Amino acid sequence: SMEMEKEFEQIDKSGSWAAIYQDIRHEASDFPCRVAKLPKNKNRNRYRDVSPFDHSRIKLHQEDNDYINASLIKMEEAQRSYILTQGPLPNTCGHFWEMVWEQKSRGVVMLNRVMEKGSLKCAQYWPQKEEKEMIFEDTNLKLTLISEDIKSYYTVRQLELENLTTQETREILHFHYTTWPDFGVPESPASFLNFLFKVRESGSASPEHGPVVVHCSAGIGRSGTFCLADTCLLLMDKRKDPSSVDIKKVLLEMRKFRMGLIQTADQLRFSYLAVIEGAKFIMGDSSVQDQWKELSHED
Numbered sequence: 255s256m257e258m259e260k261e262f263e264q265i266d267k268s269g270s271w272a273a274i275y276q277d278i279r280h281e282a283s284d285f286p287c288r289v290a291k292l293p294k295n296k297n298r299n300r301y302r303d304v305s306p307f308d309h310s311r312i313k314l315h316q317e318d319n320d321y322i323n324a325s326l327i328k329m330e331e332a333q334r335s336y337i338l339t340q341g342p343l344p345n346t347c348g349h350f351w352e353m354v355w356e357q358k359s360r361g362v363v364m365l366n367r368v369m370e371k372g373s374l375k376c377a378q379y380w381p382q383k384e385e386k387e388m389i390f391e392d393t394n395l396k397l398t399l400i401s402e403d404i405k406s407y408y409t410v411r412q413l414e415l416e417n418l419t420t421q422e423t424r425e426i427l428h429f430h431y432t433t434w435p436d437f438g439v440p441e442s443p444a445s446f447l448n449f450l451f452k453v454r455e456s457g458s459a460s461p462e463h464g465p466v467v468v469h470c471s472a473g474i475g476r477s478g479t480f481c482l483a484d485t486c487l488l489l490m491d492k493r494k495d496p497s498s499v500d501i502k503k504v505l506l507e508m509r510k511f512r513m514g515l516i517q518t519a520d521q522l523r524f525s526y527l528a529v530i531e532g533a534k535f536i537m538g539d540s541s542v543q544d545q546w547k548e549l550s551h552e553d
């Protein structure tokens with residue numbers, strides 16, 4: 255087994271996932287969020303305790319107010335960036351697509367549903383019907399649903415985003431994980447990795463494009479889990495060396511760029527499981543990807 259597998263077993267056998275996770279919260283970076291906290295930005299933040307750091311926040315190219323609750327997670331060694339953002343609010347959906355446009359993102363990963371636990375965790379920021387496109391008047395963008403591929407626990411949407419100022423259009427892919435509970439974990443490593451490899455294979459995360467946008471309700475819990483596993487698998491892939499990947503150290507590196515990434519100890523535990531199971535594909539057993547697809551019951 256791998257070094258992370260033995261560590262996983264030691265932490266399980268001694269029941270210290272809560273302790274290990276609190277250790278991560280204690281060591282995590284603390285940087286100012288002065289812009290997030292400005293009075294004029296109060297209604298641009300979904301949660302008062304979830305803010306982007308000033309040093310890594312995404313600036314909208316607006317002259318009025320450039321603030322969006324969104325962070326550039328720039329993983330230097332992995333050579334991959336992400337934008338993590340909260341679920342857009344009814345007044346920031348225009349800001350959200352403005353950011354996608356200005357950052358040249360081609361992929362949006364959504365890990366939440368619009369309604370969770372009786373609560374509206376995310377605005378309805380993309381059109382649900384081909385014939386009912388959305389126009390964002392404040393930012394001059396048009397958004398059309400082109401097609402969608404609905405599977406049992408996730409949906410992939412092809413969207414067309416148009417800058418109405420210039421009439422340039424871009425295809426944006428929407429990867430929507432629909433069965434991941436807020437503050438919870440996916441039903442299995444298999445269905446998580448099946449989704450993650452769908453995102454990887456789409457070409458959304460190609461460096462020819464801007465960073466993939468990843469969001470949940472707050473942009474930290476499920477978003478941090480997805481991003482930690484993706485980066486750890488990428489690092490393992492570049493090195494073909496599972497042993498060189500220190501998962502906790504990678505999470506602490508990500509938390510330099512946005513607070514609160516991974517919100518429960520069970521999500522941390524799930525991260526390990528996803529990485530340990532994904533390593534089988536990375537290290538040359540490609541049949542495992544077909545096993546994941548079968549186990550995830552996406553039909």
Ligand SMILES: O=C(O)C(=O)Nc1sc2c(c1C(=O)O)CCNC2
Pocket residue numbers: 301303304366375436437470471472473474475476477517
């Ligand atoms: O959606 C996620 O995965 C996530 O991080 N959610 C978060 S993080 C977070 C909250 C929520 C929420 O959804 O209520 C509420 C206030 N504290 C922090």
Ligand SMILES: [Cl-]
Pocket residue numbers: 292293294295
């Ligand atoms: Cl202000």
Ligand SMILES: [Cl-]
Pocket residue numbers: 366367368369
């Ligand atoms: Cl939804």
Ligand SMILES: [Cl-]
Pocket residue numbers: 369370371372373
């Ligand atoms: Cl509900």
Ligand SMILES: [Cl-]
Pocket residue numbers: 342343344374375376377378
């Ligand atoms: Cl909302």
Ligand SMILES: [Cl-]
Pocket residue numbers: 279513514515516517
């Ligand atoms: Cl935290």
